[PDB]
């Protein structure tokens, strides 16, 4: 009846609000075939393969262009910086909606109702529809699980229909990138998924919608982790994928607010999600004990290698480097509860994994440097590794998450700065990546830096200015190996560091030029690196 209103017909079996026990038994059903199948690991958690897609597909992301979105969305084709917000006609949207609704017609469907956003005043009431048990599990893990009371009066104001099993044969004619699609309609308030089974598309899809609606009513919407000390002091950690937001916010000395998506309104910082989505490549029990410990029944492992005897080879990246596990946030012992939110952040930390080996492990940023490095959104990676090559490859992703921005970067920078100023927050840049050794800084050294930021040690330290990037760096910090604080010390000579710094400075300078078409942007150039 109600499923019909969405266009899904002849649904025989409806599993509304599936329990964790039911999801466990659905995933291990021995008659499942293909990518629906789960296998039980010795840690008690079920592991699945997500299919050919093992990460987001930005090239398949489309947003319907209509009178509601025309003048507010950050469109990929309106010459305002590179992004993945590709415009979609309403007519083609109706075609994709027919593909997905027909695929889900005549099937057994899982329907998960959940919240995106910790606060009733700004949260989305999302209804997720799928025919794959582990997809419903993923959304039960990653979104906010309502109370029985909230379920009774649940009134969806966004529908996500996951049609991973269907594809679009009309895509060439329609000007699309492939037979797969991840599409959003703000008029009908719906997300459609076709071709990719990857659960991340639903998580980041609703993130992108929050990123669109929250700043339009004065609320920051942020790609960050967040935690809070006993005294109520809040830290947020920005950064691109793989830079350490989840690894480093899971800190037994802090209460976890969230690991990936947060808003910032008049009362403080608040988590969007009900779970965490940790990377498991090379996962070390000794280095990341709380994340490791979260891997138990009700956690959902993705694309890991599971041996015949049920043990996991966390080292094996053969399916993908992006091996993951999701778990409800209460699989972490020390968290904020029952509501994932706290006060205003006073520490704002930009994580970056600098494969060029130039940036210092830690530096406290000026106000202009904060805006400069927020708009720049830099990280890099050794792309040549499988070829035995050191191909440092830069990524500049505005606000440390341009793939999920629905508005222009400046709109996120503006509201972040307003929130920071009102709170007297301070910002820091942390290289969680490489130095002159050609190896990453150890997790142990990085946690000690984060400690030094949070407890005021770094603020009381004697500092000097790193040349070129003009970053204030400490001579020493409690519990941190002193040699690494100056990035020049791990090369044969400061001159060898300088050669790489000049290379990276020019990358930053070229990237930043697109923000200088305003007076404020051009004024920020002086805060960036100077040859
Ligand atoms: N010094 C370090 N600091 C943080 N992480 C490190 C360090 N050295 C290695 N790592 C590894 O880098 C990865 C950090 O990934 P993490 O899951 O924290 O990324 P993220 O910022 O949460 O990304 P996403 O937004 O995609 O979820 C982990 O695999 C971690 O084990
Ligand atoms: Mn993460
Ligand atoms: Mn993320």
Swiss-Prot record:
One of its GO terms (molecular function) is metal ion binding. It is found in: Cytoplasm. It is an enzyme of class 4 (lyase). The gene is pckA. This is Phosphoenolpyruvate carboxykinase (ATP). One of its GO terms (biological process) is gluconeogenesis. Involved in the gluconeogenesis. Catalyzes the conversion of oxaloacetate (OAA) to phosphoenolpyruvate (PEP) through direct phosphoryl transfer between the nucleoside triphosphate and OAA. The modification N6-acetyllysine is found at residues 78, 514. GO terms for cellular component: cytosol. ATP binds at residues 204, 223, 239-247, 288, 324, 440-441, 446. Its main location: cytoplasm. Pathway: Carbohydrate biosynthesis; gluconeogenesis. Pfam families: PEPCK_ATP. Binds 1 Mn(2+) ion per subunit. The keyword Manganese applies.
